[PDB]
A paper describes a structure:
Aminoacyl-[name] synthetases (aaRSs) charge tRNAs with their cognate amino acid, an essential precursor step to loading of charged tRNAs onto the ribosome and addition of the amino acid to the growing polypeptide chain during protein synthesis. First, the aaRS combines the specific amino acid with adenosine-5′-triphosphate (ATP) to produce an activated aminoacyl-adenylate intermediate which reacts with the appropriate [name] to produce the aminoacylated [name]. In general, aaRSs are divided into two classes based on the global fold and sequence conservation. Crystal structures were determined for a CysRS from Borrelia burgdorferi bound to AMP, GluRS from Borrelia burgdorferi and [name] bound to glutamic acid, a TrpRS from the eukaryotic pathogen Encephalitozoon cuniculi bound to tryptophan, a HisRS from [name] bound to histidine, and a [name] from [name] bound to lysine.
The cognate amino acid binding pockets of the [name] and human structures are very similar and make many of the same hydrogen bonding interactions.
Residue numbers in the entry:
A (entry chain A): 15 to 154, 161 to 506
B (entry chain B): 14 to 153, 161 to 506
Amino acid sequence: ENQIVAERRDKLRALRDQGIAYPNDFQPTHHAADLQTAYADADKEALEAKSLEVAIAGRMMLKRVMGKASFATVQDGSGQIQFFVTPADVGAETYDAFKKWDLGDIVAARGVLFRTNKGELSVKCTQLRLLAKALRPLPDDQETRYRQRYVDLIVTPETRTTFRARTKAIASIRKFMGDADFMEVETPMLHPIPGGAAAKPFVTHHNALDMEMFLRIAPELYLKRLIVGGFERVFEINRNFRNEGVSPRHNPEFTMMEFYAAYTDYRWLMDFTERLIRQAAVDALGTATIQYQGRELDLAQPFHRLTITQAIQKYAPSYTDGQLSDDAFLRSELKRLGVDVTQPAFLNAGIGALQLALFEETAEAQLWEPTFIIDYPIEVSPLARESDTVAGITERFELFITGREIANGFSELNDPEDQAARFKKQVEQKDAGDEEAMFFDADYIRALEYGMPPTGGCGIGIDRLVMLLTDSPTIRDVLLFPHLRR
Amino acid sequence: DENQIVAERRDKLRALRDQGIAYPNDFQPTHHAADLQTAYADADKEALEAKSLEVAIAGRMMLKRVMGKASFATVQDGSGQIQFFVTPADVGAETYDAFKKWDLGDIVAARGVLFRTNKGELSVKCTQLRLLAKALRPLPDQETRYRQRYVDLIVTPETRTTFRARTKAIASIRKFMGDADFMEVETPMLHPIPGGAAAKPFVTHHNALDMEMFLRIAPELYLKRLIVGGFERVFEINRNFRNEGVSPRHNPEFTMMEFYAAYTDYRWLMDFTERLIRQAAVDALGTATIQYQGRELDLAQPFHRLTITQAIQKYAPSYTDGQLSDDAFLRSELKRLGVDVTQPAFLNAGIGALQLALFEETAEAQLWEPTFIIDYPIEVSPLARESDTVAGITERFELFITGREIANGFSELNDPEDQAARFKKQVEQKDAGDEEAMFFDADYIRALEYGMPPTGGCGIGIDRLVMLLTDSPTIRDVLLFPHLRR
Ligand SMILES: N[C@@H](CCCC[NH3+])C(=O)O
Ligand SMILES: N[C@@H](CCCC[NH3+])C(=O)O
């Protein structure tokens, strides 16, 4: 390993004594992938007539030297093609230098396209150059993929494909939002008071002003300020930050899309979110009837819509109606399953919150088929409009697919006095030790007091959506550079 | 006094809650003011009475004209303004009486027939009229625009126009990049080692991992890892963070676009950046011959391309060639202009850096017409490829328009040994007190040691570009929520 690097470093030393070691004048004219497509059906004779001159640059992935003739496989950004090399065509000095290059080196050739006797498409090199020496060899392990994504990208074509699909899916989501009349906006990543979500923040400090500032846990409160300001339809796709546990399923920064539509409510949001996701599949995979991790996932069907208790009953039928309505039962049953209900997060827990907690331990992970869970207790929905007909319930949903939260939304709380009250109740929890409880945001209350129209809002987890569209088993597989441990 | 008004409005809200749902969310508008104004600009009183078009509108009540038998309100939705004509005959006495006590600012809604008033205005003959949300604070100095952008957005149509244009411009830039085959990517905003720029970082901490992290000053080093990985054309549009003073011309977070193209160099980058900017103007304004702050700005002309000393001579013709190549002259001349060259940023200053510093104090702010400044000293260009023909010079540019930096780019340093050396020289400066000097990044060097193809990279200041395109005088005028200033 070190001896290999040293040997390659010594070649680089010699290379510098005889010219420009890292030249930047070569201009490729074609892409391997495009040649493989456009000339799949052409044969030795067809190609000899066309006599197409090409110029390719990329990473040398294989090399075979056999006396007066040598073959290499070169990989550019698009794919692979062979270089065929003889001193007759490339000249003796280049041929000799070529033989001493290494797997990994960035190389470049001009030459005529042709087909080898074994059937492969290849370049009869008439010019051949080394553009950049690979000092470290390519490997020929489970975490290296993430610590050295650049290696994973060279060596695993599937990885390149996943990330091209991420990019296309996000463009497709933008198009969908734009067609539905939403204005894409940029709100701050630095907040003087974090909010818009239940999460532990990252804190930093502005030196000139001697001021604590928080990386955003969510843009929600800023996006609703825009609604007050009179933009009826806004959305934002960007990072949130959450300072919590690390795992294969957790990264400290992740991409959310939030959107807000004045004069809508949660029923509208659910229909709209459902349509968006289904179209996201059709765009990415040609169909909404797909598979994820070896199991059928039919996004073409209408999404299920269930209450919290409906969902517990569907997947944990042993629970009776009377049991799910009994405070004392719910507490002992939650204690049994490892939920400490004495924790400050539960300071304002009523019967609804206990049910929700039971749903999380029993049913949630089993929501394979797309399922909206509907009507959430007020005590855990501090930003959500209260029902007009049932006290203590909010017009809120969460969407689960494959057992993971993909979206969450609600009729927005536009009543400033209600909002102030619910903030004070969060501060109680926070004072009692609940680190995911919200801070009182006076500037936000002030904004609402200018008068905010009734509005519907939703956040979609772009990283999790992309997992489904690319059959990626963890969030780390859809992030170019996941954060890792030391 | 603003207080008595709030209190009075708060008391109306109290009465409102005793008689129904204060913040209803069931009203569904069917039309937009702007669309009605366009579609029926050409129609008259009789036309409209025949058509008899039933509409439903919701928005903010901006003016109210009251007479004995009737009332007119000017209501503003997301699209524009339309009049509501209100009589108790048609809306009912009880509603008419309530209406008289509603306030400028309230969010209101009507159904009714479209018609034209004798004074020529398009209006709704209301048959239903509702209050959707009480404005508790009344609608209405130079900094309030920024602390309360939501107020500025309601009251100033120019502000709305600027931000719609920002959004459109960014979509136009994404399209330009996509058409040129660049793949949009997302790299981390939390870096374990900050780099890619000369700036003071914001520092934070991940608690679960007990790990110091930095908010990114630039994504550059992560984008070049993707080039090692084999993506040929990548770009990213997102926030950087710099922990320094807030001014009218500075915000601690701002939007950059960086792009990288394998097998290109700085000449290519300059042509590409020039085309991008000119097309951005055509897209936004219909022409590249535009105006900024009352002065002609002709982006249609080819951009000037000057060396650092050429530019000093163009604006200060006193300076001779020998003066600008004399160390002792440059120092005394810099001392005269108030520049401290003893500062650690200048620890590795040679003649080039001194020239650059003189250019900053004499010519830079006068670069009104788009001007590329070209060929930068190595000691201030730690990430830029060195010239093949002139030692100590890098293939680097900065683009200035209206005296402000709009872009900066270079042929990328893909030589890992050169890069390691230049990093060690940065660490010297940093150890001697230069807080903008770079840290040594070993992981980045390791990536380059796998072999990176020659590449060209550039960063464009989106916020500053958008200023030019929208004729905004400061960066704060193109950010929805600028950071606090004192
Ligand atoms: N802010 C929410 C998404 C939007 C909820 C509706 N206002 C989140 O972080 O999940
Ligand atoms: N990282 C640079 C932009 C790209 C320079 C070329 N690699 C900046 O922050 O200005």
